[PDB]
Design a protein around this ligand. Structure first.
Ligand code: HEO
Ligand SMILES: CCCCCCCC/C=C/CCCCCCCC(=O)OC[C@H](COP(=O)(O)OCCN)OC(=O)CCCCCCC/C=C/CCCCCCCC
Ligand SMILES: CCCCCCCC/C=C\CCCCCCCC(=O)O[C@H](COC(=O)CCCCCCC/C=C/CCCCCCCC)COP(=O)(O)OCCN
Ligand code: HEM
Ligand SMILES: COC(=O)c1sc2ccc([N+](=O)[O-])cc2c1O
Ligand SMILES: [Cu+2]
Lengths: 183, 657, 96, 261
């Protein structure tokens, strides 16, 4: 029951340590630019603002899904979960768009240490969001097949913890790398 | 496309004898399991979600990898004996580097870590009076991820090489430009998968200790070994993410040509040394904390005396857990940081030494005014106190940055950490193995061969690493392979004798296991409580039932089972046995680790199609297991009644109570 | 919890916009900007924790506030110590 | 712990201070470790289980005097150790200029594949796997690496400072006695790591050092350009001592700038 939720919280703490290590690497290598981008010329902060709005909307829609899960309503839980998945997919495709724009130009992860650290931190958060999206798709399928059963309510709570934790990590990312990058 | 694989395995060199004997021996077991039980080995073991069977399998893997790690140790000791006095050894540098890197990796990750994790798996759920771990399928998957790492490391001895960089693969030498070979890829992927498994088992045990304790056992009535396990799992959860990230960054550097740790394009190669030791020392206390608990029991069990400083030991362990994350820089003092940073981290490394001393004196005052029965485990405990005191003394001697400047990578450091591991984790894992052998197999290990193994181990270690302390004072550095200074020949030829004596000790341990299994029907631990006993683990049959408790104990006191024996409420048949809910054995882990062995190997050799179909295989097997719904079974009351009647009738055949 | 989640939505929107506007439009010295973005990030993280994650001291008989407190203490130790060690190293790695 | 070992018989002032620190820490930790081992074996025989004259006091868990002592004495020992450690760390930091009357001899050390390279910038010398410097004269090593991380270690003189590609570390060592002191790489660097053994000739006086400098100046080959450094930087394990008469004026800076760009 709640043991799975507590264990997933402890794993989210382990991932907090993982992201802290990636943040330390980014903070070390932020000035490790080697004749290339200095961050202020690539971050394009309107992109970051719309992305942060998208991920916050995803978190809010998942919260609505959770409060609708407390009520016994299968349909609206699936609807809010689909909306959350759409927001997260937009987030991921927008970060794949940004990473593609960096990669096609000479400003890839192999260009400099700063770009490698930026790619590590932001693409690791992106891979966490993508894994959360795969988990959300599987959870939507399982909820549709079996309903809001005890196993699926626990999974709903665990993925809620995961998604809000990812949103918090993105708060720290856009604050640390994107905003401080552009002074 | 087989991609980078090709077919040079090891043909130019004679290490295909061992690759020839590891596939022959496999054939042997392939025959032996064929001439016997295969469906038993799959239904009961190899798919089990039972903490006892998974702990036993962990310890079996630990012993098996201990044999290869010690073979590497013997080869290194003979190479260093031969290279000193002039003669070119039987190991060229490219092979000696593989050998010491694989010795360090096999011993830290596949001998010491699995042995401790297996002891915790076998004991902790019993001590807290829990039926099973919090996440049993996650415990099976963690074990099989550790097996994936073992298989990748052993395969590195076959197709390809293992990293010629050191057991932590420092970044400039382990970069793609200076280490183009697949050795660092083997290192990276075996360590990544074993780290995933270790992190999952840390989550499992943390949640098992926090949530699944028996009703009435408060956190300060908990067995001390369980406290040590809880602290070690806290360290696992807060540290192994650091290792995962560091090895992932090394992976990106070696695969995508990134510049986290390269020396040219803005990369800072010192940040890997900061990070790899940020996990390095916590994982050094991940190994030594549980064995402390192993001696917190074996002393209180073999002194017929309540453990002295329970609150003091618990708070010392918590202090060690907190302080283990503020000491890392003591592993790269000579990297060149300022005097303030080196001095601060040396001060913290000496501060983290007071709790360990408090624990040592708590054990030796638990022996104070007690009935010390010199069982094999008690001998291992006395040996651990004696040698671990020396090893910690030498480590604190290294903790001062001034001394570490002249002793950073000498053989004095090798002697330090082998003193604190061999006299620590190794002595505590052999002590725990002998102590809980009746609680896992029912038989009792032959005490004669156990004492012989202990004496051989302690004498051989002392006569194999004190020479390394002298060599560290003579200026001999780590990882020297060829043309050693003949000034060092005498100490290296005394350390060769010590390695031979430790070989004799491991042989004595093997003989002990063989004779105990051969004499299984004698020393059968009928009561399920040999050598006295002071914790809930000894309130069960010698092989505990798969549920391990028909009725969860109430544990009104700290030393629960000893208090139940003194109070006389030790063995009570309950009025009714209710059906109890058990997890069902699931082989999905096997599949979520078979595709892990593929994915890793197909990543080590740049077989992208097979790496993609191994990663997809892992993720899809995870989805399928997620879709599974019948992952539990209520055990019928008839089985519980039969098992409990057998146990209580066996008790009646002894002092019945 | 719908009221709590909507208050979190409003607080997080007004806590994300302000730092973005400060950085984009300047309007402060490049010392007030850093302080305000860090403070807004900390407050927004706290909001996302208390509101959306339902983090409370009573849950899980503790060990949910305790786990996060210990994890953020380890995060602070690792990040601050890594930054201090690497800064001192890089100063000591210079041609000076 | 050999009597004539490199560390417990050092010929350098830094080595002497580090040996004093090692001995003080060893004794101050022994006054608590020797009791630990002696009680581990005594308590074991005395109380035993056969000995029936023992007190056999079970359930004796807590004692305020015993716990007070066991939390007090290690704390006092570690407080003294921490004070001594702070003082000796700020005194023995490799980048400290040693506060000596004689003008330090600057040697720019460049670890290479499996060999050591030494640029004397004021003398003009270049050398492979060999250094010389006057005894009782400060020596300022600006240590860097060309391929991978090493550790410039002279066991009989003192600190071992890490050599890192693209990074200049500082190590001040002074030899109080003349003689040839072995030096090694203390960090593993590759197959030829066992052959990164150089010698440090602490010459009796300035005259012998000047004669060694003149002998090095009598070298047919030079290090005039970076192509010569790159040819020398080719992978070779057991290099022999080799001298170069003159060097590029800022070769060491250029060696580091190969990485810092
Ligand atoms: C089991 C794992 C383990 C443990 C528990 C320890 C325990 C300690 N270690 Fe070690 N070590 C371990 C394994 C290692 N150490 C290392 C490296 C290492 C390094 C330097 C790394 C380098 O230079 O490269 C230092 C300075 C220490 C110090 C210490 C100290 C102070 C302790 C203390 O915790 C010891 C505490 C115990 C004591 C002190 C004895 C008991 C106390 C008594 C008897 C009285 C107490 C009174 C006082 C303390 C005043 N360790 C390395 C890396 C080697 C490599 O890979 O290169 C490893 C593997
Ligand atoms: C070809 C595909 C390419 C994809 C590329 C993008 C990366 C995608 C990565 C996906 C990883 C897997 C995501 C999760 C899938 C499984 C979800 C799942 O099973 O959900 C349920 C599952 C189990 O619930 P129970 O009720 O206990 O089930 C009982 C019965 N088994 O719920 C959970 O709690 C699982 C939580 C999963 C969290 C996954 C977190 C992933 C983190 C990724 C970190 C990446 C770090 C960066 C490095 C990446 C590599 C370079
Ligand atoms: C490409 C880089 C290298 C790594 C590639 C592989 C990445 C990871 C692949 C998957 C490995 C983990 C599989 C996890 C399986 C499910 C775990 C789980 O949810 O456990 C629950 C238990 O409840 C939990 O939620 C467990 C606690 C929370 C665990 C959350 C993390 C699980 C692992 C996620 C991935 C971690 C690593 C990601 C990559 C990091 C970077 C390499 C189920 O177990 P039971 O309790 O027995 O329930 C019934 C099962 N039939
Ligand atoms: C009693 C059996 C063992 C013997 C005889 C032994 C001996 C050795 C020797 C000779 C070396 C090489 C030292 C050098 O020249 O640099 C070595 C390295 C090492 N050993 Fe052991 N060892 C043993 C068991 C262990 C155990 C149990 C561990 C820890 C779990 C361990 C961890 C290491 C590590 C980490 C290294 C350094 C690897 C590296 O430099 O990359 N060893 N050991
Ligand atoms: C990288 O690892 C290696 O190069 C080698 S060589 C060798 C020879 C014998 C054994 N042995 O008997 O276990 C092991 C190994 C081993 O691990
Ligand atoms: Cu350490």
């Amino acid at each position: 029951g709640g043991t799975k939720i507590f264990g997933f919280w402890i794993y989210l703490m382990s991932d907090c340590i993982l992201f802290s290590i990636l943040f330390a690497t980014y903070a070390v290598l932020v000035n490790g630019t080697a004749g290339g981008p200095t961050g202020k010329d690539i971050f394009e902060l309107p992109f970051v603002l719309v992305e942060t709005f998208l991920l916050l909307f995803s978190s809010i829609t998942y919260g609505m899904a959770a409060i609708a899960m407390y009520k016994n309503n299968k349909s609206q839980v699936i609807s809010w979960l689909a909306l959350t998945w759409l927001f997260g997919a937009g987030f991921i495709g927008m970060e794949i768009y940004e990473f593609h724009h960096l990669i096609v130009n000479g400003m890839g992860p192999d260009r400099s240490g700063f770009l490698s650290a930026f790619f590590a931190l932001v693409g690791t958060h992106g891979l966490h969001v993508t894994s959360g999206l795969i988990w959300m798709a599987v959870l939507m399928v399982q909820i549709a097949r079996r309903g809001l059963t005890s196993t699926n309510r626990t999974r709903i709570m665990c993925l809620s913890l995961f998604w809000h934790f990812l949103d918090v990590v993105w708060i720290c990312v856009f604050t640390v790398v994107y905003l401080m990058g552009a002074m | 496309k087989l991609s980078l694989d090709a077919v040079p395995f090891h043909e130019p060199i004679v290490m295909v004898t061992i690759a020839g004997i590891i596939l022959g021996g496999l054939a042997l077991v392939g025959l032996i399991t064929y001439f016997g039980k295969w469906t038993y080995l799959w239904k009961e073991w190899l798919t089990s979600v039972d903490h006892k069977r998974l702990g036993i399998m962990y310890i079996i893997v630990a012993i098996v990898m201990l044999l290869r790690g010690f073979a590497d140790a013997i080869m290194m000791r003979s190479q260093q004996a031969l290279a000193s006095a002039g003669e070119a050894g039987f190991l060229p540098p490219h092979h000696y580097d593989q050998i010491f890197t694989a010795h360090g990796v096999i011993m830290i990750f596949f001998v010491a870590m699995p042995f401790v994790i297996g002891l915790m798996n076998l004991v902790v759920p019993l001590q807290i009076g829990a039926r099973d771990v919090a996440f049993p399928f996650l415990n099976n998957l963690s074990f099989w991820f550790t097996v994936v790492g073992v298989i990748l490391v052993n395969v590195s001895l076959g197709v390809g090489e293992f990293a010629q960089t050191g057991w932590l693969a420092y970044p400039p030498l382990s970069g793609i430009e200076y280490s183009p070979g697949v050795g660092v890829d083997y290192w990276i992927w075996s360590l990544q998968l074993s780290g995933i498994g270790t992190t999952l088992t840390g989550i499992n045990f943390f949640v098992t200790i926090l949530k699944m304790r028996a009703p009435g056992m408060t956190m300060f009535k908990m067995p001390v070994f369980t406290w040590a396990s809880l602290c070690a799992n806290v360290l696992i959860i807060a540290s192994f993410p650091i290792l995962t990230v560091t090895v992932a960054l090394l992976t990106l550097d070696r695969y995508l040509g990134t510049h986290f740790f390269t020396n040219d394009m803005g990369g800072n190669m010192m940040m890997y040394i900061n990070l790899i030791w940020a996990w390095g020392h916590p994982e050094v206390y991940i190994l030594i904390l549980p064995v402390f608990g192993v001696f917190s029991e074996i002393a209180a069990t073999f002194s017929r005396k309540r453990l002295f400083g329970y609150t003091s030991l618990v708070w010392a362990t918590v202090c060690i857990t907190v302080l283990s994350f503020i000491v890392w820089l003591h592993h790269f003092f000579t990297m060149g940081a300022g005097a303030n940073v080196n001095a601060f981290f040396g001060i913290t490394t000496m501060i983290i030494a007071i709790p360990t001393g408090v624990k040592i004196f708590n054990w030796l005052f638990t022996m104070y005014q007690g009935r010390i029965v010199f069982h094999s485990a008690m001998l291992w405990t006395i040996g651990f106190i004696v040698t671990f005191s020396v090893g910690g003394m030498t480590g604190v001697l290294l903790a001062v940055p001034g001394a570490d400047f002249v002793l950073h990578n000498s053989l004095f450091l090798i002697a330090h950490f082998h003193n604190v591991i061999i006299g620590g984790v190794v002595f505590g894992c052999f002590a725990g193995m002998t102590y809980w052998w009746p609680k896992a197999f029912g038989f009792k290990l032959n005490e004669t061969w156990g004492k012989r193994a202990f004496w051989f181990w302690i004498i051989g270690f002392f006569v194999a690493f004190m020479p390394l302390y002298a060599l560290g004072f003579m200026g001999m550095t780590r990882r020297l392979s060829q043309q050693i200074d003949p000034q060092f020949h005498t100490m290296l030829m005394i350390a060769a004798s010590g390695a031979v004596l430790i070989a004799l000790g491991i042989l004595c341990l093997v003989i002990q296991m063989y004779v105990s299994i051969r004499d299984r029907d004698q020393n059968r631990d009928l009561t399920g409580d040999p050598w006295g006993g002071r914790t809930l683990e000894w309130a069960t049959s010698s092989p505990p039932p798969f549920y391990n408790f028909a009725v969860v104990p109430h544990v009104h006191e700290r030393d629960a089972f000893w208090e139940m024996k003194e109070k006389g409420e030790a063995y009570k048949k309950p009025d009714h046995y209710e059906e109890i809910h058990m997890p069902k054995n699931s082989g999905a882990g096997i599949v979520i680790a078979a595709f892990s062995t593929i994915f890793g190997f197909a990543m080590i050799w740049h077989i992208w199609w097979l790496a993609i179909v191994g990663f997809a295989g892992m993720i899809i097997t995870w989805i399928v297991k997620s879709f599974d719904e019948d992952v539990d079974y209520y055990v019928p009351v008839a089985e519980i009644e039969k098992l409990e009647n057998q146990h209580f009738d066996e008790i009646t055949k002894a002092g019945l109570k | 919890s719908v009221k709590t989640y909507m208050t979190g939505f409003i607080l997080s929107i007004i806590l994300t916009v302000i730092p973005f506007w400060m950085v984009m439009t300047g309007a402060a010295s490049p010392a007030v900007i850093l302080g305000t973005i860090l403070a807004m990030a900390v407050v927004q993280v706290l909001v996302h924790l208390v509101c959306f994650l339902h983090m409370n001291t009573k849950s899980d008989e503790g060990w949910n506030m305790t786990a996060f407190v210990f994890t953020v203490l380890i995060i602070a130790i690792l990040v601050v110590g890594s930054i201090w060690i690497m800064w001192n190293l890089n100063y000591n790695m210079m041609m000076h | 712990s050999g009597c004539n070992s490199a560390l417990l018989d050092p010929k350098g002032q830094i080595g002497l201070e580090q040996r004093s620190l090692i001995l003080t820490a060893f004794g101050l930790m022994l006054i608590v470790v020797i009791p630990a081992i002696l009680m581990a074996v005594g308590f074991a025989w005395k109380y035993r289980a056969s000995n029936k004259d023992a007190k056999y006091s079970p359930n004796w868990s807590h004692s305020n005097k015993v716990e007070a002592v066991v939390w007090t004495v290690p704390i006092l020992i570690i407080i003294f150790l921490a004070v001594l450690t702070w003082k000796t760390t700020h005194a023995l930091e490799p980048s400290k200029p040693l506060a000596h009357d004689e003008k330090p001899i600057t040697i720019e050390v460049v670890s290479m594949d499996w060999k050591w390279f030494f640029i004397y910038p004021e003398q003009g010398i270049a050398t492979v796997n060999e250094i010389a410097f006057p005894a009782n004269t400060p020596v300022y090593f600006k240590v860097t690496s060309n391929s991978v991380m090493n550790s410039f270690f002279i066991p009989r003189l003192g600190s071992q400072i890490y050599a890192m590609a693209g990074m200049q570390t500082r190590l001040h060592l002074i030899a109080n006695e003349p003689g040839t002191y072995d030096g090694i790489s203390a960090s593993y660097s590759g197959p030829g790591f066992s052959g990164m053994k150089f010698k440090a000739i602490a010459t009796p006086d300035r005259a012998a050092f000047d004669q060694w400098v003149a002998k090095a100046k009598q070298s047919p080959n030079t290090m005039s350009d970076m192509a010569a450094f790159e040819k020398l930087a080719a992978p070779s394990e057991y290099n022999q001592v080799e001298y170069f008469s003159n060097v590029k004026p800022d070769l060491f800076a250029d060696v580091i700038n190969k990485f810092m760009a």
